[PDB]
Amino acid sequence: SPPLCTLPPGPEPPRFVCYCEGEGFNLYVTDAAELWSTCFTPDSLAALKARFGLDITPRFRAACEQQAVALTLQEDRASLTLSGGPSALAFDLSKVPGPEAAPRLRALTLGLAKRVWSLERRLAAACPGESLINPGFKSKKPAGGVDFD
Amino acid sequence: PRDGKDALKLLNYRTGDFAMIAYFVLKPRCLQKGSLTIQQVNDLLDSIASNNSAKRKDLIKKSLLQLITQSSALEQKWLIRMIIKDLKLGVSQQ
Amino acid sequence: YSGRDSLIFLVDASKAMFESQSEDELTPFDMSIQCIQSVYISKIISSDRDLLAVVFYGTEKDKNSVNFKNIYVLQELDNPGAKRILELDQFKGQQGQKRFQDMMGHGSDYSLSEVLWVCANLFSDVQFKMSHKRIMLFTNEDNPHGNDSAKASRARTKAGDLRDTGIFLDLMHLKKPGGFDISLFYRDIISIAEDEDLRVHFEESSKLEDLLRKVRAKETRKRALSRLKLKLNKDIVISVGIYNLVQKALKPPPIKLYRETNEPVKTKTRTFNTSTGGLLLPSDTKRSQIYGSRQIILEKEETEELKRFDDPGLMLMGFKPLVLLKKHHYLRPSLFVYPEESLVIGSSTLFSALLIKCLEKEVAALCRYTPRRNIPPYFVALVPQEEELDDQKIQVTPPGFQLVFLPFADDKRKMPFTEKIMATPEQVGKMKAIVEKLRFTYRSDSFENPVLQQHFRNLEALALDLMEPEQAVDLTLPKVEAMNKRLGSLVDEFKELVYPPDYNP
């Protein structure tokens, strides 16, 4: 159950959708046309964890369920604020190239469709040739001699 | 078959008596009507006892095979109980 | 396959089996007797170490180890012989049919559970190790227990017990007036039921024709001639077994019998001094060779030591392209080398790697071969063999190495000098036409040894006291009649082109 959230989630149609995957895990936020990813790396991830004293996945899921995620966009930069723990955590993202992202949107759409189908289904129910005389010896055809073609 | 259910049941009788297990095993195999009289059964038992005294198990095996092949499952169970010397008919010897 | 083969023939003796529908058609009982006799002959020739038994059920008289009624055990499990064949033949004819009826009887009730029980008892009475336990049921009836269901359940239970034990049963259904329905009652008794063999059979079983097909050839079980050692290096070593996929067939050795009583006679030999008249042993003898006037004396141990170069086994030397292996450089039949793995672990993987690499590179491994101690070494070539299987996944060429002996210089002989004479194109074309006319497909088993077949037939005639031995047609003849009829005028044209008129070959 990969956590995800939408903004706005109220009666107004959502504009942006945020999620996480592959815990090179990077938070992906998309407007269905453009994307923003953290592009985390093991060294950068370790440095961030040390700075914040650190898994973020449980906190991210708790915020998404409680809709405690704050978005900000400015040109190609995006800022996320996550709340629910002792101290809110801030993350930055840059506009990932479109050519590299197109497979990402395709995979996200396919996974969303699969999840929709699965969750709807779940909610609905709620030795020829062996010689007979000598076993173990293959039967042998009688000698036909010379049969001209 | 040594590994067949009947063999293990006969061997693993929790050393529901052995006679009942033997009767259940022999029910699908034995006949419906025997042909041995009381005198023949007594003679076979006497032969088995004498051969056991004389240390000759071949004759014991032959007599047991004859008894098995010429009696019905109920007869086999009653013969087993008689050999074991434990009937428990519900009425005392007195 | 380790052990012997046990076969029990169950021949039903009901009234229906003793009646023939149409004229010029042998009764099913006689057909079963002939099939049993043919199987006995085939077992005697191919492998006489097997065990065969004959049991009749449904007869008035009874002969069993338990005294079961309506069952007769004509022949207990024992090696086949001429006496049993003659006993079976005694019932072959109509007079034999009458003899069987008089001394055995027919038309009596029976239980399939009883016959299965006596068959199992017979199987359990064999002290030898039995590799295969088989039963053959000759009966034209398909619904024997149609008037009783308890007997059907007893037979089902007995068949299940036999199947669990390891007994393999077949039903050789015979011709019936109405028809045979295997699916009715016998479907649950046969060890293996084929989907095709489900419809009603209005004719004889196909297995009968195969059984009646007599086979005259000794069958030898797989056996390694020698578990030798292949040494790529003084430290690298593997174990490989040697087999003879092709071996010359020799008639059984004769035996000396006493004319007066026809009993085996023991043959013994002795050596003694003409002067002392005392027995001598090989250790009290010397070997002498005379060259002109000189005499050379060596002990037997020294003579054995003469032909001693290296320990028995195979020693690798190198790899040679297959093109250098001449087809005409043949000295002895080739052998088969296959990894053993029962002596040194990890040899199978090395053998497989070597095989695949040699196949890829098309290179044969040259080696020095010493089959046994005190044997001069020879040079052999191991050619990799690719596992070849024909349709329906039946192996025809196993994977391994083909060991071919490379002739030595002494083994080669020089031919006399001859002057080459090229043939003109017309004569070559005529010969091509003749060859194309005489085209024919060749297979490894397209011919039979006439001498061995004739010897087997003569032995059969002598043993069974037959009037004459059936002449064995030999396929090794060239049947000149058909070749002449097919060639036509090609031979005359070729003779005119090549042979001068005043030649008279």
Task: Please state the three-class secondary structure of C174-223 as a single string.
Answer: CCCCCCECCCCCHHHCCCCCCCCCCCCECCCCHHHHHHHCCCCCCCCCCC
> Which C residues 42-81 touch B at CB under 8 Å?
66-68
Is the minimum CB–CB distance between C150 and chain B shorter than 8 Å? yes
Shortest Cα distance, chain C CAs vs residue A126, angstroms:
45
Sheet with C71-78, edge to edge strand ranges: C71-78, C51-57, C4-12, C130-138, C168-171
Q: Which of C68, C154, C164 sits opposite B28 (nearest CB)?
A: C154
Q: How far apart are the first and last CA of chain B?
A: 44
CB A29 within 8 A of CB A18: yes
- A145–C447: do the CB atoms touch at under 8 Å? yes
Q: Which amino acid is at A139?
A: S
CB C1 within 8 A of CB A136: yes
Q: Which amino acid is at C352?
A: S
Q: Which tokens go with C263? A: 């009993």
C-contacting chains (≥3 CB pairs under 8 Å): A, B
Is the minimum CB–CB distance between C124 and chain B shorter than 8 Å? no
Q: Are strands A28-30 and A16-19 parallel, antiparallel or unpaired?
A: antiparallel
> Tell me, what DSSP letter sits at residue C129?
-
Q: Which of C210, C221, C439 sits opposite A148 (nearest CB)?
A: C439
Cβ-based contacts of C5 with chain A (< 8 Å): 134-135
Question: Which of B25, B21, B37 shows the shortest CA–CA distance to B71?
Answer: B37
Question: Which of A148, A110, A16, A5 shows the shortest CA–CA distance to A72?
Answer: A16
Residue C99 has, within 13 A of its CA and on its CB side, a CA count of 11
Distance CA C61, CA C49 (A): 31
Cβ-based contacts of C113 with chain B (< 8 Å): 29
Cβ-based contacts of C447 with chain A (< 8 Å): 143, 145
> Which C residues 164-223 touch B at CB under 8 Å?
164-165
Size of the B and C interface in Cβ pairs below 8 Å: 18
Chains B and A touch (3+ CB pairs under 8 A): no
Is the minimum CB–CB distance between C110 and chain B shorter than 8 Å? no
Question: Which of C23, C35, C15, C24 shows the shortest CA–CA distance to C92?
Answer: C35
CB C57 within 8 A of CB C115: yes
Among C134, C168, C219, C476, most A C-beta atoms within 10 A, so best to mutate, is C219
> Tell me, what DSSP letter sits at residue C393?
G
Cβ-based contacts of B28 with chain C (< 8 Å): 153-154, 157
Distance CA C167, CA C191 (A): 8
Is the minimum CB–CB distance between C475 and chain A shorter than 8 Å? yes
Is residue C242 helix, strand or coil?
strand
Task: Please state the three-class secondary structure of chain A as a single string.
Answer: CCCEEEECCCCCCCCEEEECCCCCCCCEEECCCCEEECCCCHHHHHHHHHHHCCCHHHHHHHHHHHCCEEEEEECCEEEEEECCCCCCEEEEEEECCHHHHHHHHHHHHHHHHHHHHHHHHHHHCCCCCECCCCCCCECCCCCCCCCEC
Shortest Cα distance, chain C CAs vs residue B70, angstroms:
10
- Give the contacts of A7 (CB within 8 A, at least 6 positions apart): A14, A15, A16, A17, A18, A69, A71
Is the minimum CB–CB distance between C161 and chain B shorter than 8 Å? yes
Cβ-based contacts of A145 with chain C (< 8 Å): 446-447, 475
- C154–B69: do the CB atoms touch at under 8 Å? no
Residue whose token pair is 């097919």: C486
Centre a 10 Å sphere on the Cβ of residue C227 and count the other Cβ atoms it contains.
13
Centre a 10 Å sphere on the Cβ of residue A93 and count the other Cβ atoms it contains.
22
C251 membership: H or E segment, kind and range: none
Distance CA C237, CA C25 (A): 66
> Tell me, what DSSP letter sits at residue C360?
H
Is residue C453 helix, strand or coil?
helix
- Tell me how far CA of residue C5 lies from CA of A128, C64, C110, C123, C213, in angstroms: 19, 22, 28, 11, 19
- C150–B4: do the CB atoms touch at under 8 Å? no
- Give the contacts of C176 (CB within 8 A, at least 6 positions apart): C16, C140, C141, C142, C201, C202
Q: Which tokens go with C439? A: 């085209």
